[PDB]
């Protein structure tokens with residue numbers, strides 16, 4: 001591959017998934033932020049697109065939804081244009097998005113989340129109490145996937161023993177025949193109707209009981225949801241499951257890798273466990289579990305001296321903006337005690353900013369509070385295998401050992 005530092009600017013294609021896989025893409029982003037920060041690529045595997053590489057420019061795009069649209073009709077919200085017809089509120093503009101999002105934001109209520117803490121902690125405690133000590137195991141399988149699946153079961157108060165159903169339904173939602181996940185579109189449809197039937201049982205059992213602190217109770221007792229159709233219910237449930245699943249997984253894996261690579265920060269965290277609160281947002285900045293989101297321009301506009309034309313694909317590279325030293329001090333450093341650790345892009349900004357963020361951060365905080373009480377070190381034994389994606393910045397496997 002060409003040297004990012006000196007190659008022609010017009011040869012730089014940051015969408016190439018291999019560059020995320022081998023984790024060199026950061027070098028190309030570094031070159032763009034310095035030398036062409038609103039960067040047009042005329043030809044790629046995804047078609048032509050703009051790369052928005054700097055923190056303030058990315059915020060401008062994300063918070064200007066009347067110019068930069070998320071609508072599924074234009075191709076949706078990933079660089080790769082999109083294809084059972086369920087409303088998908090992340091790929092929707094005003095006014096429809098707002099009522100679908102308002103249904104669900106009870107999950108943003110700190111009051112509500114506070115009621116889940118004890119359940120989260122007991123579930124994390126049991127997993128960590130079961131890990132081998134001094135023996136190698138796959139952190140991704142044993143902790144990240146396991147704990148994320150708990151977090152979704154907690155959110156829905158889903159029958160805990162059946163929680164693997166949630167990750168199966170997550171896998172099916174983005175599957176296509178030939179992939180070895182589903183063998184046909186019928187099977188996929190059949191499984192997602194089984195999901196709708198299950199969640200409908202849950203709703204039927206809860207609507208006439210005192211409400212719990214889970215989402216299904218809250219939706220069922222909330223007067224705002226009177227006119228919520230079964231398609232909206234299923235679309236909301238699958239969007240939450242997908243939105244929470246790999247992002248939280250990769251944040252759980254990422255913070256272990258960061259602390260291994262910065263053992264001085266891990267020394268500071270053990271000496272002051274209260275830093276868990278300011279460390280969790282740093283993990284999320286450092287990992288940038290979703291590396292981009294995309295938009296489509298619906299009107300000409302100017303950005304960074306460039307004209308972005310109506311119809312053009314515009315890619316907000318959150319992973320780049322989270323390395324932008326004009327906003328973030330020493331951005332390549334993992335620092336668990338920054339003064340404003342929530343100054344990052346990993347959750348986006350604007351009307352589509354992550355609705356799950358407070359639940360993710362609570363889950364991550366409780367995870368680490370519970371690690372710190374148990375283990376003196378979490379040692380990464382081999383370079384983890386990364387995911388080959390330009391969207392998911394994540395890890396398929398990471399071998400570790402824990403020490404008492």
Ligand code: HEM
Nearest residue numbers: 090243244247248293346347348349352353354355356360
């Ligand atoms: C560290 C974990 C997470 C990260 C890094 C993350 C990231 C993001 C990003 C980048 C967006 C779009 C932001 C934008 O376009 O401006 C988003 C939206 C969203 N996320 Fe999260 N997310 C995480 C966890 C969660 C969790 C735990 C849930 C569910 C419980 C969730 C549910 C959603 C939903 C439903 C949306 C769509 C919001 C809307 O369109 O109004 N996410 N997330």
